Design an enzyme around this catalytic site. Structure first.
Site, PDB file in Angstrom:
ATOM      1  N   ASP B  32       0.803  -1.213   0.000  1.00 23.60           N
ATOM      2  CA  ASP B  32       0.000   0.000   0.000  1.00 23.60           C
ATOM      3  C   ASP B  32       0.851   1.286   0.000  1.00 23.60           C
ATOM      4  O   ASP B  32       1.972   1.270  -0.485  1.00 23.60           O
ATOM      5  CB  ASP B  32      -0.921  -0.078   1.242  1.00 23.60           C
ATOM      6  CG  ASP B  32      -2.267   0.490   0.994  1.00 23.60           C
ATOM      7  OD1 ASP B  32      -2.366   1.737   0.806  1.00 23.60           O
ATOM      8  OD2 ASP B  32      -3.295  -0.227   0.970  1.00 23.60           O
ATOM      9  N   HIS B  63      -3.991   5.997   3.539  1.00 25.75           N
ATOM     10  CA  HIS B  63      -4.753   4.854   3.117  1.00 25.75           C
ATOM     11  C   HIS B  63      -4.153   3.537   3.641  1.00 25.75           C
ATOM     12  O   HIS B  63      -4.872   2.702   4.156  1.00 25.75           O
ATOM     13  CB  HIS B  63      -4.903   4.801   1.591  1.00 25.75           C
ATOM     14  CG  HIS B  63      -5.552   3.551   1.137  1.00 25.75           C
ATOM     15  ND1 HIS B  63      -4.824   2.431   0.801  1.00 25.75           N
ATOM     16  CD2 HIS B  63      -6.828   3.261   0.860  1.00 25.75           C
ATOM     17  CE1 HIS B  63      -5.657   1.489   0.408  1.00 25.75           C
ATOM     18  NE2 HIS B  63      -6.885   1.963   0.455  1.00 25.75           N
ATOM     19  N   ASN B 154     -13.939  -0.495  -7.324  1.00 25.83           N
ATOM     20  CA  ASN B 154     -15.043   0.427  -6.999  1.00 25.83           C
ATOM     21  C   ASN B 154     -15.710   0.982  -8.255  1.00 25.83           C
ATOM     22  O   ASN B 154     -16.122   2.136  -8.288  1.00 25.83           O
ATOM     23  CB  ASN B 154     -14.582   1.583  -6.109  1.00 25.83           C
ATOM     24  CG  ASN B 154     -13.906   1.135  -4.871  1.00 25.83           C
ATOM     25  OD1 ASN B 154     -14.263   0.123  -4.281  1.00 25.83           O
ATOM     26  ND2 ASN B 154     -12.925   1.888  -4.455  1.00 25.83           N
ATOM     27  N   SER B 220     -11.214  -1.307  -0.819  1.00 30.21           N
ATOM     28  CA  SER B 220     -10.004  -1.182  -0.009  1.00 30.21           C
ATOM     29  C   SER B 220     -10.178  -1.506   1.470  1.00 30.21           C
ATOM     30  O   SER B 220      -9.266  -2.000   2.092  1.00 30.21           O
ATOM     31  CB  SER B 220      -9.497   0.248  -0.055  1.00 30.21           C
ATOM     32  OG  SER B 220      -8.642   0.472  -1.112  1.00 30.21           O
TER      33      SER B 220
END
Ligand SMILES: [Ca+2]
Lengths: 51, 274
Positions: B32, B63, B154, B220
Site C-alpha cells: 500500500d 490509506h 469500486n 479497499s
C-alpha cells in the site's frame, strides 16, 4: 484534479468518487486520471461525487 | 476508550479472538502507501519500500495506515481493534503519498512478500488492465503458499458488464467486494464472475495518520477484513495450505444473493476457522 503525472495505472481502492463527462462514476482521482489518459483527453470532469 | 469497529463483530472475528486466536506469529504484508509505524495503535515489525525517496514505515497518504488498522489495530485502551490484533505486520510501500503507482512497484512488493515468507498479502489497490508481470507475481505467491487478497474494485455495476479490476481478477487472488453495516452491497462495489467474497467496506473506522482515526469507504476497506480473517484461521490452524484457507473463507460465507453481485457472500471467520 491534477492528472499531470498519469498514467500511473495502480491506484488505491478508496471510494472518493468523481463524475466524468461520459456519465460514469470513477472511484477516485487516480481512477479518473488514468481514464483521462486512456480517453485520450476526451474524458473531462463534470463534478466531484457520483453521477 | 477502545472502540470495536462494526466489521469485527459482523465477520465474527470477535468470536475467534475469544477462543484466543488473534493472528500471533502470522505475517501479513500490507502492500500500500506505507503504514504510520509510530501510530499508538499499530506495531509494524518490518517491511520494504519500492517508492523512491519514501521509507516503508511512514505513510504520507493515510490509506495504508487505515487498511493496516482493519487488519491489525492493537487490542488496548485506545483507538480501534483489528480483525487479527496480534499479527506480525509488514509495511510494503508500493504506492506513493498520492495513492498511485506503477505495476513494476507492485510486482516488487509481491516478490518481496513471497521471498520473505509472508503468510498473507493484502492489496487494497488495483488498475483497469492486467500486466503479465503482475499475473506472474501473484500466481507465484499463491503457488508458494501465500494467501493473496485484493479489493475487487469500486467501478460499480452497469447491466451485465464485468467491472472487476486487477490483480483481483486473477484466479490466484481473492477478489473482495464491499457490504455495509446492514450487510447490503455498496453501490460502488465491482461485479463479475471473479468476485469471490464480501466484507465490510462502507463507513469503516480505522487508524489514520498522524496518531488519529478516520472513516473511509471502498473495497479497499473490505479487503483487510478478509486478510485479517485469513490470519485468524492460520493462527488457529497453522498447517493449512493457502488454498485450504481460501476455500474455508468462501465455503463458509453467508449467502447474500446472486454471485455476480456478492460472490459466495459475507465472510464468517468463526465458521471458516471451525
Ligand atoms: Ca486499540
Amino acid at each position: 484534479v491534477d492528472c499531470s503525472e498519469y498514467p500511473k495505472p495502480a491506484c488505491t481502492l478508496e471510494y472518493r468518487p468523481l463524475c466524468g463527462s461520459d456519465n460514469k462514476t470513477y472511484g477516485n482521482k487516480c481512477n479518473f486520471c488514468n481514464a483521462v489518459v486512456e480517453s485520450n483527453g476526451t474524458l473531462t470532469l463534470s463534478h466531484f461525487g457520483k453521477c | 476508550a477502545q472502540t470495536v469497529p462494526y466489521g469485527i463483530p459482523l465477520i465474527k472475528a470477535d468470536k475467534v479472538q475469544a477462543q484466543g486466536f488473534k493472528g500471533a506469529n502470522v505475517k501479513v504484508a500490507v502492500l500500500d502507501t506505507g503504514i504510520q509505524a509510530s501510530h499508538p495503535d499499530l506495531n509494524v515489525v518490518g517491511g520494504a519500500s519500492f517508492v523512491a525517496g519514501e521509507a516503508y514505515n511512514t505513510d504520507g497518504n493515510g490509506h495504508g495506515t487505515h487498511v493496516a488498522g482493519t487488519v491489525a489495530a492493537l487490542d488496548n485502551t485506545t483507538g480501534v481493534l483489528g480483525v487479527a490484533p496480534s499479527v506480525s505486520l509488514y509495511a510494503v510501500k508500493v504506492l506513493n503519498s498520492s495513492g498511485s503507482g506503477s505495476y513494476s512497484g507492485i510486482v516488487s512488493g509481491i516478490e518481496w512478500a513471497t521471498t520473505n515468507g509472508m503468510d498473507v498479502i493484502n492489496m487494497s489497490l488495483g488498475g483497469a488492465s492486467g500486466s503479465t508481470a503482475m499475473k506472474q507475481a501473484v500466481d507465484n505467491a499463491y503457488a508458494r503458499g501465500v494467501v493473496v487478497v485484493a479489493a475487487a474494485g469500486n467501478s460499480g455495476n452497469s447491466g451485465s458488464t464485468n467491472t472487476i479490476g486487477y490483480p483481483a481478477k486473477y484466479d490466484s487472488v481473492i477478489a473482495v467486494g464491499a457490504v455495509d453495516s446492514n450487510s447490503n452491497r455498496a453501490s460502488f462495489s465491482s461485479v463479475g464472475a471473479e468476485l469471490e467474497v464480501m466484507a465490510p467496506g462502507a463507513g469503516v473506522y480505522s487508524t489514520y495518520p498522524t496518531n488519529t482515526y478516520a472513516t473511509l469507504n471502498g473495497t479497499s476497506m473490505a479487503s483487510p477484513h478478509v486478510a485479517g480473517a485469513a490470519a485468524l484461521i492460520l493462527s488457529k490452524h497453522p498447517n493449512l495450505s493457502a488454498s485450504q484457507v481460501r476455500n474455508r473463507l468462501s465455503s463458509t460465507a453467508t449467502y447474500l444473493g446472486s454471485s455476480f453481485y456478492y460472490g459466495k457472500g459475507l465472510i464468517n471467520v468463526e465458521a471458516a476457522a471451525q
